[PDB]
């Protein structure tokens, strides 16, 4: 696998949230999400990556006026994770289109939604509302299908290119996701991603290069069938920026019968599906590296702590980044309303690399040990940098295979050092005695 990196060259795993769904139609476009709740995040799970929900409504709220403002409030948010060593990727989300099919849908603004008059009925499950003639006709617009609006892709690339011009000098931001869950309305499947989905890809790709070469940019497949562990059609995205390229693939993971009985064995099968396309169209895209944007379910259901581990196992061995669907209060999220941990919080709260002076070819990980496997890189002079909980590791480290660096039991974060010129290293660490 290929891995995002650093500006030190370190290979990266991501780890971390969607925050926040409540983002959708908070009229500034910001989440009901606080500083004190990454502090909590943080001294709770250690993670160190988020899928920051950002919308087209906010970003461009009249053709071609950008609001810097929302731009603003959206920097002042990714500092709070600059300041605990997070990694950011900018998701520009999208459900059912917009808010103004009708609240039920969200992303683009009112003046870039085409309904033309059709209707938009009340349906029994909000994913029924992609379906419904006004929904569709919408993304026909958008994609120009209808061929009656032409510049609304164009738009949408110079939208992105606004907030790529603000964010190019953040040290924060790693990634740009360049739309939440792409829909087709009449045209689906290949028909789909490798023609006007590929094309707004490129020509988003193409403007946000225009002032920020070193973000990658995150491509997704269409959501509806490859959620679900179909093949995607989705073509290879050219970057234009000098060197090599940065792009990413960012699919999501929803298994149909989302965890027990044949119910399981049919999610279980659907990882191992969902698994070989994902490489596939990684491959397809130039050998790129994986972020799984998103993947959840209600924790209060039997078997879920062993899908999300099989999740988390899986993503480790495709060495893939993942965002959990997500830091929203409720019984999908690692805490309730309230503030009680769900059983997320335990289940997430082990140890991992976070930056690898190299590629780590294999790694484990339990409460109270990891170990770590690297191909050297003899250029990379930072080192490796690895998340250690208090749990299970109260007191000092015990290191072989690596010399100690520092061990920063207050930022849990230990930093090792391995020899490049002995083939590959592999470093235990483990509870001092
Ligand atoms: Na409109
Ligand atoms: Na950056």
Known sequence: PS???????????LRGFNTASSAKSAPDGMPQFTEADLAREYADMGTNFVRFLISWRSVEPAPGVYDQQYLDRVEDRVGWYAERGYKVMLDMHQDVYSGAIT?????????ATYMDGLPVEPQPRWELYYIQPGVMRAFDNFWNTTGKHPELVEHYAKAWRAVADRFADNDAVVAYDLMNEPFGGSLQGPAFEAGPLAAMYQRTTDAIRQVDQDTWVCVAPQAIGVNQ??????TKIDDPRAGQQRIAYCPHLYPLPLHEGLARTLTDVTIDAWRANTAH??????????????FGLDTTLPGARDYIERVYGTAREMGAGVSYWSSDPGPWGPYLPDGTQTL???????????????????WSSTSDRLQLTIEPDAAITAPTEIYLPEAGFPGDVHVEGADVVGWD??????????????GNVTVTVTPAA
């Open 229 to 234: 562990g179909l093949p995607s059609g989705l």
């Open 281 to 294: 169209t990684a491959r397809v895209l130039g050998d790129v590296p994986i972020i799984l944007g998103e």
């Open 409 to 422: 039991r207050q930022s849990r974060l230990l930093t090792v050092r391995t020899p490049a010129d002995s």
């Open 344 to 362: 997320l919080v335990d289940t997430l709260n082990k140890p991992y690399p976070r930056a690898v002076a190299g590629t780590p070819t294999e």
């Open 103 to 111: 609240a039920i849908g969200n992303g683009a603004p009112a003046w």
């Open 3 to 13: 891995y995002l990196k650093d500006d030190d060259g370190r290979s990266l795993i």
